[PDB]
Amino acid sequence: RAFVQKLTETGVANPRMLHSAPATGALTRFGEGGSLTAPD
Amino acid sequence: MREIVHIQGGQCGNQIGAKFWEVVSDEHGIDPTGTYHGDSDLQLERINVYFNEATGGRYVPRAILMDLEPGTMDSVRSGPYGQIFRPDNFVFGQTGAGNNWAKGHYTEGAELIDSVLDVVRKEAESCDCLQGFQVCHSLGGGTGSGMGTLLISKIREEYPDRMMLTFSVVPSPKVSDTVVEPYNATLSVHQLVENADECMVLDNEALYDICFRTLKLTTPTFGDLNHLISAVMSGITCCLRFPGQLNADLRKLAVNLIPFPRLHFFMVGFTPLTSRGSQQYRALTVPELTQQMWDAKNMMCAADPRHGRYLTASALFRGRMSTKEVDEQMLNVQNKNSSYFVEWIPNNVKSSVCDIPPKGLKMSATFIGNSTAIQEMFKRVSEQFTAMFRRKAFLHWYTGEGMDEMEFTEAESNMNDLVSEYQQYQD
Amino acid sequence: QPQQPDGAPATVPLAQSLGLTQDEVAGALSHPMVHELARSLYGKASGATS
Amino acid sequence: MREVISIHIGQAGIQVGNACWELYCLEHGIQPDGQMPDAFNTFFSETGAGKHVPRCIFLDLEPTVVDEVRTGTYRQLFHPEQLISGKEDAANNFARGHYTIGKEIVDLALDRIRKLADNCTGLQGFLVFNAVGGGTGSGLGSLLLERLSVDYGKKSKLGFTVYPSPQVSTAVVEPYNSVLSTHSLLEHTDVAVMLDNEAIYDICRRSLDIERPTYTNLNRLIAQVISSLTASLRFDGALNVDITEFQTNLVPYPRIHFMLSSYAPIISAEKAYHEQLSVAEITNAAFEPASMMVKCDPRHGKYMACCLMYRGDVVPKDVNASVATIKTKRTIQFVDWCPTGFKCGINYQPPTVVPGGDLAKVQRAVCMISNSTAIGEIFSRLDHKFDLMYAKRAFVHWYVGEGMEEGEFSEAREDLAALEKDFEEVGAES
Amino acid sequence: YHRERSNWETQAQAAAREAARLEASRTTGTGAKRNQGSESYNIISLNYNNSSGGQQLAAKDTAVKEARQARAVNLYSKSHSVSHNIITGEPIKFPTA
Numbered sequence A: 001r002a003f004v005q006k007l008t009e010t011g012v013a014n015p016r017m018l019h020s021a022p023a024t025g026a027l028t029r030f031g032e033g034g035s036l037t038a039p040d
Numbered sequence B: 001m002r003e004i005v006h007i008q009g010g011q012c013g014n015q016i017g018a019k020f021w022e023v024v025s026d027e028h029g030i031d032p033t034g035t036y037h038g039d040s041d042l043q044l045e046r047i048n049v050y051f052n053e054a055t056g057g058r059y060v061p062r063a064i065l066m067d068l069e070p071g072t073m074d075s076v077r078s079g080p081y082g083q084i085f086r087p088d089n090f091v092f093g094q095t096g097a098g099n100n101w102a103k104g105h106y107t108e109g110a111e112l113i114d115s116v117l118d119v120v121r122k123e124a125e126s127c128d129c130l131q132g133f134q135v136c137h138s139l140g141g142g143t144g145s146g147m148g149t150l151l152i153s154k155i156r157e158e159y160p161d162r163m164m165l166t167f168s169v170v171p172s173p174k175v176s177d178t179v180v181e182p183y184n185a186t187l188s189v190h191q192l193v194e195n196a197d198e199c200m201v202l203d204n205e206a207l208y209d210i211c212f213r214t215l216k217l218t219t220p221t222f223g224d225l226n227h228l229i230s231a232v233m234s235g236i237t238c239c240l241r242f243p244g245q246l247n248a249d250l251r252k253l254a255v256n257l258i259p260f261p262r263l264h265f266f267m268v269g270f271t272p273l274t275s276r277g278s279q280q281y282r283a284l285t286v287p288e289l290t291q292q293m294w295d296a297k298n299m300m301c302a303a304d305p306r307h308g309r310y311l312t313a314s315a316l317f318r319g320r321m322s323t324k325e326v327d328e329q330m331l332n333v334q335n336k337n338s339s340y341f342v343e344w345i346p347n348n349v350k351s352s353v354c355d356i357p358p359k360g361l362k363m364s365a366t367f368i369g370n371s372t373a374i375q376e377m378f379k380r381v382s383e384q385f386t387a388m389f390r391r392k393a394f395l396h397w398y399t400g401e402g403m404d405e406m407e408f409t410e411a412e413s414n415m416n417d418l419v420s421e422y423q424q425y426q427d
Numbered sequence C: 001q002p003q004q005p006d007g008a009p010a011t012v013p014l015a016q017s018l019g020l021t022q023d024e025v026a027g028a029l030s031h032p033m034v035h036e037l038a039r040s041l042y043g044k045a046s047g048a049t050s
Numbered sequence D: 001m002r003e004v005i006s007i008h009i010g011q012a013g014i015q016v017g018n019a020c021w022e023l024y025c026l027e028h029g030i031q032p033d034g035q036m037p038d039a040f041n042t043f044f045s046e047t048g049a050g051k052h053v054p055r056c057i058f059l060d061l062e063p064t065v066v067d068e069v070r071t072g073t074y075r076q077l078f079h080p081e082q083l084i085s086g087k088e089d090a091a092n093n094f095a096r097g098h099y100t101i102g103k104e105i106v107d108l109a110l111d112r113i114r115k116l117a118d119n120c121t122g123l124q125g126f127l128v129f130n131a132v133g134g135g136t137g138s139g140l141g142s143l144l145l146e147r148l149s150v151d152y153g154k155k156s157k158l159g160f161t162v163y164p165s166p167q168v169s170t171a172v173v174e175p176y177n178s179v180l181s182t183h184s185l186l187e188h189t190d191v192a193v194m195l196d197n198e199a200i201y202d203i204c205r206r207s208l209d210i211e212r213p214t215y216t217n218l219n220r221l222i223a224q225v226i227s228s229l230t231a232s233l234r235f236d237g238a239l240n241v242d243i244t245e246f247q248t249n250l251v252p253y254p255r256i257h258f259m260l261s262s263y264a265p266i267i268s269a270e271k272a273y274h275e276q277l278s279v280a281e282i283t284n285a286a287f288e289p290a291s292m293m294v295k296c297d298p299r300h301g302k303y304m305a306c307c308l309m310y311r312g313d314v315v316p317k318d319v320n321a322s323v324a325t326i327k328t329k330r331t332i333q334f335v336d337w338c339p340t341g342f343k344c345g346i347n348y349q350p351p352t353v354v355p356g357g358d359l360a361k362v363q364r365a366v367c368m369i370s371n372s373t374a375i376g377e378i379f380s381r382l383d384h385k386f387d388l389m390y391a392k393r394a395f396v397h398w399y400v401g402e403g404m405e406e407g408e409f410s411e412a413r414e415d416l417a418a419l420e421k422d423f424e425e426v427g428a429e430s
Numbered sequence E: 001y002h003r004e005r006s007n008w009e010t011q012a013q014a015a016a017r018e019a020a021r022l023e024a025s026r027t028t029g030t031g032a033k034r035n036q037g038s039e040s041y042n043i044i045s046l047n048y049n050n051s052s053g054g055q056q057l058a059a060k061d062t063a064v065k066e067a068r069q070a071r072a073v074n075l076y077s078k079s080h081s082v083s084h085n086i087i088t089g090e091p092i093k094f095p096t097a
């Protein structure tokens, strides 16, 4: 169950973007409008 | 793959529902955080009946919590097994019904019913199949009584071919924490008799009597009363969640218990209740559970089973046991006192066996009784209603919210019509 | 989980028990065959564990 | 959120309000300056950082009591312009507080109420405190309840009014201001809680063993009645009974809205000697006729409805049993049409004790508010003294010349005649 | 950046304070004060709870057992007069298992 769950939650549709596998993003946050990124 | 959607209403339903989800989560091995840490493979096989799969392996209950004042949801969210519930299901009012059946039905219920219907449509349409709907509420109150009965009206109009199992706690003769229980209960039953497919009748005085005379508790609390309800509520769904030699859904218990559409008020009881002193001397055996099953003290209704004949009955045994003495024991009670059973229905009792007993018990059984003795608890509600309706007591509060005095009479007439067809089968 | 017998050997973990390399354990999910396995596991919604 | 706004009118209102808000501070740990060292939201609104101000106004025509609060032990607690004063008092006249001198001050009162109503998120009711004996509590109290009904429709109002005693009175125009104030609170005040002065003097004499009780000692335990009534809102309880719970469950008829008051455990600090009373004994004490806050015997009348407010460690079983034992008692008689009229409000915080107060620490307490037909003799006793003075037209020229017309005195009297009439026939068996 | 960072910090601090007080009320037992059972043992299955109340209940049960053992010793000792079984010559001992 953990095996299948981990493979399903790490699975991706396009195989060529898997090369990055071997900061969160704005749309994950959906808030902190003026606080996206930081100075310096 | 077939599921039950649970709806809790008001002060009573939220506390009863929180104890109900305390037991079935312990049965299926979900910790208060949410992760499955059970130690049985059969627990995980049927999770989808009561829990949704979430990310990270978490399970959230398929429950809708609704009320009209936010006091309950401060208490429910703060308790053990309390953070597993979805906050989107936490739909709340602000005014509070205040023990008024008309306030929850027409005035402030109406703005909240459109909100509670969207989350039911969100939860029922999210699955593949529905076994039915399970609701626990009160009749003497106002928050779960007036608002709950309109919810049953709209959900039956939208989903007409699905089961409706209601655990309604009725006003009590011995105890009474309110003044307008006969007003709210008579209006609730008049809305419930045509809409609810089946009904479990509960009361506080029978639960207090079980905790006192049978379970030997010196100072029982509402938590003790809600635990007896929770064991029975999980006992109805025993064959759904777990395999067995006999399988029975809510429709299996529906078809064997109502000869006619209007006789859908049952009385329930949980069998293996014993004080701590005599547990080692008592031999937990199928004749012992059957003896306590038909006993009048084990019933969780105000109706005395010796006064009225049982029309139909159901026994839901849990645990590894032989069906022969299961069948023979209910055969024995049909022949020992045949006057307590109806004559024109043969094989009055339905039996089903589940092979997974509850936690900490080797054997258990849940009893469902369709009895004509349940007319007597509705008469006392009707007797107290006619005590105050003839002098128009507390009626100006009800007519303020927009309900006329006319539909108190069809509420009165259908209460008297419901009991009148009960005595015609007792003879 | 059954309790281990007394005088247990205290067995070594699986990865370098069976001899996995650092490249394999780093790129276990990056292999195309593992990606196809994950795609089929996603496709089998509830029958993946069957 | 659950918020309540109380209004205190007249000399009795402010001095009760000094005593009641004294108890509300120590219940929530509020220091006298107004700084703590989520339950506080029902009575205190936090302003800025750490400053909590009461949700009440103190309006009085006489400036000699409001400045005592302004220089007393709670100067920093109240908002500086939340307390309303006047240049001259009504001087025991209902006509002055209603028409001539009450009109200029009442417009400033609604401005404070409207700003308090806008600040609170959800307002649940009004607790009005006034004395019908004096001019300011009667006249300005009647006008404030007149404007609050039109401005805030269908919102609940709780009336804690001090009626004159049959025996002990402090003024000769006590029945005149009481009769006229009764007409205003009949159709405007949703709940009237009966309070009497020397009935509490009897309670302090025989239970608190205070040989020389004062008005401050009277006001301390009448504050405990208000706190035990509102304790469901402030703290979590087994069976919460809100304000809107209370109206629809205690008044059977729209004009029968008068209820009695009783607080069950009353023991002095020395009189306790480390003992506790069970639930059944204090429930028997609440229905004891001499333990009530007004001088009416319930044996003559019959209990139309009842309400029990329990505090502290009370299990739900014995309070249900204590209801059953009271019902089987023959001395307490109930009306025939109401089979079950009791209530259970079980909060799980014991009532606190103020430092230096007469009341001792108790684990459990009962606040008993009950509708009964025994109030008919309460209105008849004020009617008996009023008819003696009105037949000779004594103490009337002050009322007539101050704007008020003569013919409305009979209009207020005939309403008490109707209020005496329907008390007899509703309690009559059918 | 300071302005909206302070705004989001106030929002998250309020949310975290609410979550922390709910978690504290959960772990101290104040939450669901309506629903805990008396005597700290499971009503349906006669088994001790996994809490300190259950541990103290087990301790009280052991103390009651010890007191009953003492009373049984007293009754046996002053029921038998001699250190000898009357029928068969045998030692007299307090029966335990």
Ligand SMILES: Nc1nc2c(ncn2[C@@H]2O[C@H](COP(=O)(O)OP(=O)(O)OP(=O)(O)O)[C@@H](O)[C@H]2O)c(=O)[nH]1
Binding pocket: D009, D010, D011, D012, D013, D015, D016, D061, D062, D089, D090, D091, D092, D093, D131, D132, D133, D134, D135, D136, D137, D162, D169, D170, D171, D196, D197, D215, D216, D218, D219
């Ligand atoms: N129980 C109690 N009664 C009080 C208290 N203070 C005043 N009273 C009552 O009030 C009556 C005196 O009339 P008041 O209502 O105080 O007069 P007022 O409100 O100042 O009105 P004006 O004199 O016209 O300004 C007395 O008979 C008392 O019964 C108090 O602190 N406790």
Ligand SMILES: Nc1nc2c(ncn2[C@@H]2O[C@H](COP(=O)(O)OP(=O)(O)O)[C@@H](O)[C@H]2O)c(=O)[nH]1
Binding pocket: B009, B010, B011, B012, B013, B015, B016, B099, B138, B140, B141, B142, B143, B144, B145, B169, B175, B176, B177, B178, B204, B207, B222, B225, B226, E034
């Ligand atoms: N078994 C049980 N009964 C309850 C509980 N809470 C309230 N009741 C009963 O319900 C009646 C009043 O219900 P009420 O609080 O008005 O329900 P509401 O409509 O949601 O406000 C009382 O007589 C109680 O005996 C509970 O947690 N468990």
Ligand SMILES: [Mg+2]
Binding pocket: D010, D011, D060, D061, D062, D089, D090, D136
């Ligand atoms: Mg004055």
